[PDB]
Amino acid sequence: DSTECSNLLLQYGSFCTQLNRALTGIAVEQDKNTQEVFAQVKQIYKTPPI
Amino acid sequence: DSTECSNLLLQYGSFCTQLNRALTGIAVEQDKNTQEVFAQVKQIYKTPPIKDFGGFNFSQILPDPSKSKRSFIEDLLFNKVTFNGLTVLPPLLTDEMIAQYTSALLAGTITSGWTFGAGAALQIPFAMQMAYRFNGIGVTQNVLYENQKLIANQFNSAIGKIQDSLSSTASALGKLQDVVNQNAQALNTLVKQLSSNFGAISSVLNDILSRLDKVEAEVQIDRLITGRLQSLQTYVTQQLIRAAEIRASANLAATKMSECVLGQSKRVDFCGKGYHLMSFPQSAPHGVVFLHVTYVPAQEKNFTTAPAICHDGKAHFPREGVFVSNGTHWFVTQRNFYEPQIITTDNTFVSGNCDVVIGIVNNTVYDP
Amino acid sequence: IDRLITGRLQSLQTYVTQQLIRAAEIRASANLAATKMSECVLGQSKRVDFCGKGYHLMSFPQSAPHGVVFLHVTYVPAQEKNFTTAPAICHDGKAHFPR
Amino acid sequence: KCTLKSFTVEKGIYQTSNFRVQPTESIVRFPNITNLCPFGEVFNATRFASVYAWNRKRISNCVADYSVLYNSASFSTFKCYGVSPTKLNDLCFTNVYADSFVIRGDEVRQIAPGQTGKIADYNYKLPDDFTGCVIAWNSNNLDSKVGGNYNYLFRLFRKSNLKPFERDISTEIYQAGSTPCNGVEGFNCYFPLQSYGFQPTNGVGYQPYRVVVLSFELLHAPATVCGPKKSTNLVKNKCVNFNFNGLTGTGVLTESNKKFLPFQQFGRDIADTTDAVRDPQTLEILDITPCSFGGVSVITPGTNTSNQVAVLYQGVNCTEVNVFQTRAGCLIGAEHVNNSYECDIPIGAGICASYQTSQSVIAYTMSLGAENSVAYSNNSIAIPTNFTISVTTEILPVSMTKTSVDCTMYICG
Amino acid sequence: AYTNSFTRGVYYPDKVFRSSVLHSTQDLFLPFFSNVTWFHNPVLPFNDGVYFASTEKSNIIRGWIFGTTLDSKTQSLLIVNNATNVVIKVCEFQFCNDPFLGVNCTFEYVSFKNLREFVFKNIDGYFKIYSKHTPINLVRDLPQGFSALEPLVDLPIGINITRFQTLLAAYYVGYLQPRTFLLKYNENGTITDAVDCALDPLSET
């Protein structure tokens, strides 16, 4: 949160935005990986009381 | 094409040679990925001049000769998916060659079943091929021949719903569109990075060479070289990571070609939901589409059941199928379709006496 | 010296990044070879074209430098003849199907 | 062989180089040469100043063609200081100044950096660091007269010497003694101005000259005086180097259907690339296209077989470069064969190449396999009467060579 | 008195044609839905730059003065419509303490029914002017809608400006601020719409 540094970092162009976009793709994939394994069942089946 | 810059770039050595070698490996792999999905047919099989397929209608997945020579559904698929030293190289197989491969795979499947994958294509009538696929899911083949018009109508109707979906929406094609979008965004980012200073006096290389004398210009140009070389190393690394994912997807598609199209898979959910009958390949931009045909059971009834039955002190078990009761009588049925039969000495086998089995029930076994 | 350090460190980071990407391709190939050992050597696979072309009978592993070779033994049908065929036959007003 | 760093080459297609169409010539275009600085009214006008009271012109907001001075034989002397005169056609300045006077031919030598003597001391002083120009011509034909010209004066006397450009025009009495002046001469009291009295009979150092002195400054405020822009003819449909308004580049220039608004000068692509321009002289919109470029690939059978090769100029049209055009590029040294085979060496877009029979590299459309109409009917089956046991080989990679690096010994050692 | 700016005060930021594209740019812009000071002639701040507009059918407003003192001690810009033609000068003017037109100089230049709108900014020694003119459905307040101001002149003056005043009846003054805008260029290369990227979270999106 230095403004003096931040205005120099703007001169490097897209690098900062494409690092955030890469890590966001990792994060959205982790929820997809979890759906593909567990969310296969259509209905929440229950065992009988006996 | 600045010669003052080009002679400074010599100081970095192998870097541009090994970036070009890395992208050339990605480019050669895309032809290999394609060849392994589509070139699974030894011969360009073709369908007969008359369509005597037992009431099944493939006209919307077969080639249209009035048109490339794509199917009607392959035309819907091809409609719905949509120089700073940069070049695009053509694929080795043209879209017309990919469509001849899907045509041959489809024609081999319809005219000879699973046999063209194992050796020579052996012809079989299509209703007799479908009867073998019913035996493959554990349904007796008389269930096909006694329902052949219903089964053919349910297939022809379900193929019509694919056309209606692909005419009206692109929601499932987002997988192929995302591959087009990601490669376009990555090249636009690489080109936009030529507008950046990286700390230099200007992002324009001729401008530096006009504002400054030789030794001062050389220090400013090395910042553009450093930032542009890093900008390109970032692109090539991301294309290497992205190609490894497309190769995993192409290996999966090549396995679905062999196991779902050239065969009948026993593997649960591998060829869609329900019990796999057969599937058909259709070509798409940068991809394949499989139309997976499956048997889904539809209208269940409850029955009382037993593991075995007692007769003359002998315990009888069903040879295939399961024992069921309608509340008064006892029958044996096949497991996947209700077709009750009288319990007989040739529907069943004996093993030991009535004392051991938990939940055995008393009945006649008829001896023919 | 900082110019040499910077360029040599970038040279070595490029090598290690490409060895990580290349090792992931070799792992996928070793996982495939370990699956072919179980399903083609320790069993008989019904999966089409998993253990060579034709109907799989058995396969034999042979070692090679940095790899494995599978000798896949398959049944290929060889000399077909044409016949007339029927789905069922009529007898005493009833349909018979092949068992 | 040099691309692969080897004396032996295996069968394949290898990229060895990049092709790039070179610029045929250079174009330069700037707006029509206009708003020239008013130097004709400084140098070529009728009247001229006395050296005690020089006329200064301020030159601004204009283009200054110094070549009209330095190439002209119209002058008895021309000089520039700190800057070469031919470079003044390139340089641009916030302000420029021209100082003008009539002076005797000897006292012209006092018109130099940091000078001394009656003109430098009491009429016109230049600093020791003076960067600028001096232009002088004999004016005995204009400024001398029979019986002596009374129009032209210098200051002989003053209380103290002038500072650089100190434009004192006073007639005040110089005094150096106790008797008061009261506005007139007397004991140690002197009237400051004297006539040169120029006569046409005079020797060269006593003849009149007209002189102009030019001074330049570039400041934080933008350059209002600038070098006159040269320009070429405009060349279309060919690869050229170019410069429009100072926007430099290289490419092929073509007539276009783009509809720029009247103030717009350049056109840009989605990714900031310039893809059109307006010609600043005749206001056409020109599409800019890159000069043709692509990889150069050498197609070879192995050197164990032969030394023959074919060459592919990737994505290039053969017009830019047997010779054969393909969608993969211009293909040179391969015989086009229109009977198809399995792909030996892949070229792209359905084309492959092989070395075949009298022996040459050949290029062909690849064959996908033999055709077969399967003998289907709703009534017939084929059944195998025999088998072959087949043994097939599959090869799989399992491991790499295990490597370690001491990063401190690689980098330093 | 104060009024809403709506989506007014966008101008073409550079001399570049772009077509059927969305271009993102940072510059001194009048922020969307900001308020503007409304007048029916004080000395005013200039700040980073000014948006000015009036509703007109009668030529009441003739010109402007710009500088630090706007008076005698140092050079100041003067801009005046001399009936047939515009006249611009940058003299050290010894003119009135409360100037109007009744019912040395280092540079010089010579060129209700409607809303007439102008933008003034003085970046790195150049005085920029942009403008537009339109018919209007309302006389007393700024018209809701979109049109972009086109550059008139780009003057190499190099004078320090911190204040301005108008020479003479409704007119409005707004101040530019450093902002990022996303500008929509149509097939003719005209700016037809914009997003002020700091207005609200949907505009950031």
Ligand SMILES: *[C@@H]1O[C@H](CO)[C@@H](O[C@@H]2O[C@H](CO)[C@@H](O)[C@H](O)[C@H]2NC(C)=O)[C@H](O)[C@H]1NC(C)=O
């Ligand atoms: C269980 O199935 C049997 C048929 O196999 C049913 O028995 C028949 O019922 C009809 C009248 O509904 C009689 O005319 C037949 O003579 C019966 N056949 C035999 C073999 O007995 C029986 O009704 C069914 N039970 C229930 C509860 O539905």
Ligand SMILES: *[C@@H]1O[C@H](CO)[C@@H](O)[C@H](O)[C@H]1NC(C)=O
């Ligand atoms: C096959 O399906 C198409 C599409 O519904 C239809 O046009 C055609 O007439 C059908 N042909 C037969 C023989 O049913």
Ligand SMILES: *[C@@H]1O[C@H](CO)[C@@H](O)[C@H](O)[C@H]1NC(C)=O
């Ligand atoms: C089977 O019986 C139970 C109890 O009557 C009922 O809840 C269930 O819905 C029945 N299922 C079918 C297929 O009829």
Ligand SMILES: *[C@@H]1O[C@H](CO)[C@@H](O)[C@H](O)[C@H]1NC(C)=O
């Ligand atoms: C089911 O449970 C009952 C008791 O509720 C028992 O009598 C019967 O033998 C059991 N049958 C089986 C198959 O377990």
Ligand SMILES: *[C@@H]1O[C@H](CO)[C@@H](O)[C@H](O)[C@H]1NC(C)=O
């Ligand atoms: C089945 O039959 C035997 C012999 O009659 C009898 O002993 C037994 O109790 C019967 N079991 C049931 C469950 O009715």
Ligand SMILES: *[C@@H]1O[C@H](CO)[C@@H](O)[C@H](O)[C@H]1NC(C)=O
């Ligand atoms: C089978 O029948 C077809 C059609 O008559 C014929 O082309 C083919 O040669 C026959 N023989 C075999 C062995 O398939």
Ligand SMILES: *[C@@H]1O[C@H](CO)[C@@H](O)[C@H](O)[C@H]1NC(C)=O
């Ligand atoms: C420049 O001069 C040429 C002379 O032929 C004339 O045709 C053209 O209109 C002029 N353009 C401008 C912008 O003054």
Ligand SMILES: *[C@@H]1O[C@H](CO)[C@@H](O)[C@H](O)[C@H]1NC(C)=O
């Ligand atoms: C090659 O260039 C010529 C001349 O411009 C043109 O007629 C031809 O169509 C071009 N062919 C290809 C494949 O680019």
Ligand SMILES: *[C@@H]1O[C@H](CO)[C@@H](O)[C@H](O)[C@H]1NC(C)=O
């Ligand atoms: C190519 O095709 C033409 C007919 O279009 C034929 O006459 C010619 O001999 C063929 N050339 C080669 C070298 O195959």
Ligand SMILES: *[C@@H]1O[C@H](CO)[C@@H](O)[C@H](O)[C@H]1NC(C)=O
């Ligand atoms: C089957 O094929 C073998 C060669 O593979 C041949 O020797 C043998 O005679 C054939 N048998 C029949 C019955 O055709």
Ligand SMILES: *[C@@H]1O[C@H](CO)[C@@H](O)[C@H](O)[C@H]1NC(C)=O
């Ligand atoms: C206009 O903005 C100023 C400064 O933010 C504020 O003092 C004033 O109350 C506002 N007026 C209206 C009507 O919004």
Ligand SMILES: *[C@@H]1O[C@H](CO)[C@@H](O)[C@H](O)[C@H]1NC(C)=O
């Ligand atoms: C674009 O320009 C053409 C004339 O060149 C004009 O007809 C059209 O209305 C303009 N606007 C659009 C949106 O095409």
